[PDB]
Amino acid sequence: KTNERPIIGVLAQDVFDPKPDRNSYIAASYVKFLESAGARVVPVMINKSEDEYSRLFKSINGVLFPGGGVSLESSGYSKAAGIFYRLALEANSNGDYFPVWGTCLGFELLTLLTSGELLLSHTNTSGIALPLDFTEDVKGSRLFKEFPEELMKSLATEPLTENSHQWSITTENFTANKKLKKFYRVLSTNTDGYNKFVSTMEAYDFPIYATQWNPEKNAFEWTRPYIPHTPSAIKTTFYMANFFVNEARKNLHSFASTEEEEKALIYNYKPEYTGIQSAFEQTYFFN
Amino acid sequence: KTNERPIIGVLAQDVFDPKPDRNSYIAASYVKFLESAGARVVPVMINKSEDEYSRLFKSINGVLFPGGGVSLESSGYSKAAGIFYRLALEANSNGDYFPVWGTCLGFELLTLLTSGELLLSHTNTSGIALPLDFTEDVKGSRLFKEFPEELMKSLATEPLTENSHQWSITTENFTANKKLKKFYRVLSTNTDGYNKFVSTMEAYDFPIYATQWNPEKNAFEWTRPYIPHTPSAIKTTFYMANFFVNEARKNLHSFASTEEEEKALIYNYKPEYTGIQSAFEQTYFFN
Numbered sequence: 001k002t003n004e005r006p007i008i009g010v011l012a013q014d015v016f017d018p019k020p021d022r023n024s025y026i027a028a029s030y031v032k033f034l035e036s037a038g039a040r041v042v043p044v045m046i047n048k049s050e051d052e053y054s055r056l057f058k059s060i061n062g063v064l065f066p067g068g069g070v071s072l073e074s075s076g077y078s079k080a081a082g083i084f085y086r087l088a089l090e091a092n093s094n095g096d097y098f099p100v101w102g103t104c105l106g107f108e109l110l111t112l113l114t115s116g117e118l119l120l121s122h123t124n125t126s127g128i129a130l131p132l133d134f135t136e137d138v139k140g141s142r143l144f145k146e147f148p149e150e151l152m153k154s155l156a157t158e159p160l161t162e163n164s165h166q167w168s169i170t171t172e173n174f175t176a177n178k179k180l181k182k183f184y185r186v187l188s189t190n191t192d193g194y195n196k197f198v199s200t201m202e203a204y205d206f207p208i209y210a211t212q213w214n215p216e217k218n219a220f221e222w223t224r225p226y227i228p229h230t231p232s233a234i235k236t237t238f239y240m241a242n243f244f245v246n247e248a249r250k251n252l253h254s255f256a257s258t259e260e261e262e263k264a265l266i267y268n269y270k271p272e273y274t275g276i277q278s279a280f281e282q283t284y285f286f287n
Numbered sequence: 288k289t290n291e292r293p294i295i296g297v298l299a300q301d302v303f304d305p306k307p308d309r310n311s312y313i314a315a316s317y318v319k320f321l322e323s324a325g326a327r328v329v330p331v332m333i334n335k336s337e338d339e340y341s342r343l344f345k346s347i348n349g350v351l352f353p354g355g356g357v358s359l360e361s362s363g364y365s366k367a368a369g370i371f372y373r374l375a376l377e378a379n380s381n382g383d384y385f386p387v388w389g390t391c392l393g394f395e396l397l398t399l400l401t402s403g404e405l406l407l408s409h410t411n412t413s414g415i416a417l418p419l420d421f422t423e424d425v426k427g428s429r430l431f432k433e434f435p436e437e438l439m440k441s442l443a444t445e446p447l448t449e450n451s452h453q454w455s456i457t458t459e460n461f462t463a464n465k466k467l468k469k470f471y472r473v474l475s476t477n478t479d480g481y482n483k484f485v486s487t488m489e490a491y492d493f494p495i496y497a498t499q500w501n502p503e504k505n506a507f508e509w510t511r512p513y514i515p516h517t518p519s520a521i522k523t524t525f526y527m528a529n530f531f532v533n534e535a536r537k538n539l540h541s542f543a544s545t546e547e548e549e550k551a552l553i554y555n556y557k558p559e560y561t562g563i564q565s566a567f568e569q570t571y572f573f574n
Contacts, residue, residue, distance in 0.1 A: 004516045005509060036323035038506045038521035148435070219325045222292065229291045231533060234325035238525050246518060267568055273554045281554055 006248040007261070008034050009044045009056065009063040009084070011106075012286055013077040014070045021287045023047075024076065028271045028282035030066045030103070033216035033237060037245035041266040044084075045286060046076030053080060057087045059255045059264070062099045062248035065106030067164070067214050072105075072112055081106070085113045092206055099207035099247035104165055107201075107210040111169050115179045120167040124192035127226045129159035130213070132188035132199055141187050143202050143209055146246075147239050154232040161199070161213040161236070162227050163190070164279070168197035168212060184210075207247050215240040223279050293535040294548070295321050296331045296343065296350040296371070299573050300357045300364040300392070308574045310334075311363065315558045315569035316507035317353045317390070323506070324528035326535060328553040332573060333363035337370055344374040346542040346551070349386040349535035352393025354501050356453065359396055359405065368393065372400045379493050386534035389497035391452050394488075397497045398456055402466040407454040411479045414513045416446040417500075419475040419486060428474050430489050430496050433533075434526050441519040448486070448500035448523070449514050450477070451566070455484035455499055471495075494534050502527040510566050 010031065012024030024046040031041050042060055044053075063084045070077050084100065091098045102110045112118055132155050138144060144152065154160065171189060174180050188200040190212075199212045218233040228236075255261045262268075266284070275281040297318065299311035311333040318328050329347055331340070344350075352368050359365055371387070378385045389397040399405055419442050425431055431439065441447065458476060461467050475487035477499075486499045505520040542548035549555075558569035 032319065032322060035319060036506055036525070038516060038518075040509060219323055222327060229325060231325075231529075231536070234529065234532075238323070238529075242518075242521070245521075249518075262563065267560045267562060270557045275554060276549070 001252075002249050003061060003252055003254075004249060006039045006061045006245055006251070007042060007059075008039045008245070008248055009042050009060045010034070011044050011063065011065050011077060011081060011084075012046050013066070013068050014046060014075045015285070016070075022285045024286045026066065026284045027280040028284060029216045029220040029280060030064060031266050031284075032220045033241045034064065034245060036219070036238065037241035039245045039248060042264050043266055043269065043284065043286065044080060046080060048080065050083060053083050054087065057084065059253055059260070061251040061253055062101070062244065063088070064101040064103065064244070065109055067104030067106065069105065072109055072118065078109065081109050082113060085110075088208070089206070097207060097250040099209065099244060099251070101244045102208070102210035103216065104212060104214050107212045108167060108169070110208065110210050111174075111180060114183050115177050117177070119169050119173045119177060121170050121173070121195055122166065123168040123195050123197060125163040125165050125168065127224060128163050129226050129228045130161050130163055130190050130199075131156055131158055132161060133190055134188050135186050137185050138187050141185065141202060143187060143200070143243055146243065151232060151235055151239060155236065158230070158232060160218070160228045160230065160233045161215070162217040163213050164226075165212060168195065171196045171198065174198050209244060220281070221279065222281060223275055288539070289536045290348060290539055291536065293326045293348040293532060293538070294329055294346070294552075295326045295532070295535055296329050296347045297321070298331045298350070298352055298364060298367055299333050299571075300353065300355045301333060301362050302572070309572050311573045313353065313571045314567040315571060316503040316567065317351065318553050318571070319507045320503035320524065320528045321351065321532065323525065324532035326532045329551045330553055330556065330571060330573065331367060333367060335367075340367060340370045341374060343551075344371055345540055346548070348538040348540055349388065349531065350375065351388040351531070352390065352396055354391025354393060354452070357392065359392075359399055365396055368396055369400060372397075375495070376493065384494060384537045385540075386494035386496070386531065386538070388531050389495070390503070391499060391501050394497035394499045395452070395454060397495065398467060401470045402464045404464065406456050406460045406464060408457055408460070408482060409453060410455045410482045410484060412450045412452050412455060414451050414511065416449050416513045416515045417477050418442060418444055418446060419448055420477055421475050422473050424472055425474045428472070428489065430474060430487070430530055433530065438519065438522055438526065442523060445517070445519060447505075447515050447517075447520050448498075448502070449504050450500050451513070452499060455482065455486075458483050458485060461485050496531065496534075498527075508566070508568060510562050510568065
């Protein structure tokens with residue numbers, strides 16, 4: 001038994017200088033990422049009631065906490081992410097499979113959510129393309145099980161992952177945090193040459209997955225010299241997304257009606273061209 | 288040497304009962320289909336001068352002819368496609384590798400473009416999903432070369448390719464026409480009950496690839512039940528697009544300047560929500 005019309009939530013994030021109709025935003029590249037692996041998408045608004053969130057939670061099939069630069073502590077983004085985090089834990093312990101995906105800022109957010117602490121250090125990683133230095137524990141993993149061996153071989157030797165983060169969590173900080181060490185299997189590391197950090201991870205016991213890098217960018221973003229656009233990079237964003245959506249398909253939630261569905265989908269919104277100015281070709285702004 | 292920022296053309300087609308800002312249209316799933324394979328998109332307006340289809344041909348890196356139900360002889364569509372077809376032939380002859388893709392209507396139109404004759408029959412193929420009855424010659428084929436073997440088997444065995452076409456060419460009419468049979472290599476066939484048709488093909492001496500079915504829909508359209516949506520369906524839409532974009536990676540054309548490139552991209556346009564009603568979640572409408 002499965003759900004082959006999977007619908008996935010994407011978290012909006014506080015506009016730095018809000019104005020009506022600019023309160024939150026989602027980079028269109030996160031939408032393309034999930035659509036391309038066969039999902040439909042719901043933008044999750046920011047300053048909402050516990051209960052609207054739960055409703056929404058009960059309706060969708062997975063969440064993605066996307067990259068960015070807003071507060072991990074005081075932002076709307078961080079509130080909603082927390083609420084989705086615990087709802088997802090509960091539901092999963094109740095046989096109700098619900099996956100969470102954290103990209104960049106979302107990865108960081110998850111280290112905070114599960115550790116109860118802010119463990120970040122500065123890295124020289126604000127715009128660089130990097131292989132993955134895979135761990136022993138990779139042959140175990142879920143995330144990569146279905147990747148062509150040849151793609152795995154490329155991700156290890158070729159600059160295919162986009163890093164655009166000011167912050168990271170080092171190997172030592174991670175390994176030394178008791179809550180993290182037992183919650184997350186670490187699938188990959190990288191280094192800027194000084195600090196060594198966690199680049200990809202996945203919960204031992206939960207469908208929670210996170211990358212410090214931005215998979216979405218390879219296929220869908222074209223604004224910076226350091227975005228990977230080789231044939232293996234494009235295959236990277238596909239297989240990455242394909243796994244998370246293949247995870248959402250195990251979830252069996254669905255909306256109360258279908259008039260509710262149609263009213264909540266990304267189709268309902270129009271992005272703007274923001275590619276001359278920002279790192280994103282296209283962005284959805286919300287009230 | 289190759290081009291890692293490929294830009295592909297998709298042709299708009301005539302709107303049934305035109306209005307201003309409604310003279311032609313492109314379903315957004317053709318845009319998603321290319322972008323997800325790591326190409327940027329350029330919508331090619333409908334009733335324009337030759338010199339201009341030529342300034343466009345020279346700038347972009349391939350063309351796709353999207354499906355539809357519009358005249359194959361007197362449409363703004365077919366006049367434009369014909370011009371790109373001849374431009375593309377002449378460039379390949381001259382060492383300028385330039386690929387062309389024909390989907391459904393565009394497949395039907397290619398047959399007319401290369402034989403010079405309208406050779407189509409009615410088939411019962413409006414809204415049905417089918418595997419693909421491959422031919423002997425798929426084994427040495429270009430299009431299917433980089434596909435996983437498991438996927439080739441899933442495709443020969445499962446309702447993976449969606450079909451919403453009123454017409455097809457039978458194999459009989461294909462084999463019988465001398466130009467087609469010497470120009471195009473047949474990769475797959477289907478049948479509807481008493482009619483047996485060509486459903487996938489590529490050219491022997493030019494990078495021209497066509498499908499009678501619509502790969503794009505699997506991942507991006509949810510309006511209709513016959514649209515396949517299994518993990519294998521979803522892999523099929525990406526491998527198809529991936530091949531095409533890899534072909535465009537071999538063309539080295541560029542725009543005379545970045546402003547000129549920026550003005551031409553699908554980013555300048557906002558699609559309308561049309562999924563309540565139409566077969567298409569979102570559709571781009573042009574003046």
